Design a protein around this ligand. Structure first.
Ligand SMILES: CN(C)CCn1cc(-c2ccc(F)cc2)c(-n2cccc2)n1
Ligand SMILES: [Zn+2]
Length: 195
């Protein structure tokens, strides 16, 4: 009833990477290594790098899923709030209920799990562009952490899994996410609080 969040590099040495975007007031997406936490604005591009030591087989896929970080909420499906699920902002592929979208990939598939009811979005693994050392996926988060009747100020984690063609686990990584109006300020504040 709860997806594992255990970091697992697996046989291919799978792990995530994030850009270094800084904490200026104007920043739209920024990652804190000290907090393992991504801060982003609503519906803005979040670049996430996929790193491997060796190339996985054809048919390998990468899935993203959100869960609540606090144990007492972890069995609750993370979904868009009653306002955002009804705002008709679909890209024609993502169901309006899904928090996490993949941007600019027509091969993205959205799953409503028939047993757990959890949402996820999965894309085929593709080779890096010539000249690049990793592949990047662009995610969007479609509700604020503060949305009432949705996340309602509760922190979430995104779990990224590398899967074979049957959906079996090959690798796993994860990060906390806060979707907020001013990611730069919030990252600075939370990093100061930690210190
Ligand atoms: C070590 N270097 C060479 C890795 C380059 N790379 C190939 C794939 C790759 C290429 C084709 C395919 F079918 C599956 C993975 C991939 N990758 C990993 C996650 C998502 C893409 N990275
Ligand atoms: Zn919302």
């Amino acid at each position: 009833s709860v997806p594992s969040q255990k970091t697992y590099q697996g046989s291919y040495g799978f792990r995530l990477g994030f850009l270094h975007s800084g904490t200026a007031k104007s920043v739209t997406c920024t990652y804190s290594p000290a907090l393992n936490k991504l801060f982003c604005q609503l519906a803005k591009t979040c670049p996430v790098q996929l790193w491997v030591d060796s190339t996985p087989p054809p048919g390998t896929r990468v899935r993203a899923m959100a869960i609540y970080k606090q144990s007492q909420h972890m069995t609750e499906v993370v979904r868009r709030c009653p306002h955002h699920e009804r705002c008709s902002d679909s890209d024609g592929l993502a169901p309006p209920q899904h928090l996490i979208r993949v941007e600019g990939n027509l091969r993205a598939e959205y799953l409503d799990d028939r047993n757990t009811f959890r949402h996820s979005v999965v894309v085929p693994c593709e080779p890096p562009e010539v000249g690049s050392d990793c592949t990047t996926i662009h995610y969007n988060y479609m509700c604020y952490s503060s949305c009432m009747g949705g996340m309602n100020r509760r922190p979430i984690l995104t779990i990224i899994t590398l899967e074979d063609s049957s959906g079996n686990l090959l690798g796993r990584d994860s990060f906390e996410v806060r979707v907020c109006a001013c990611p730069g300020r919030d990252r600075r504040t939370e990093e100061e609080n930690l210190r």
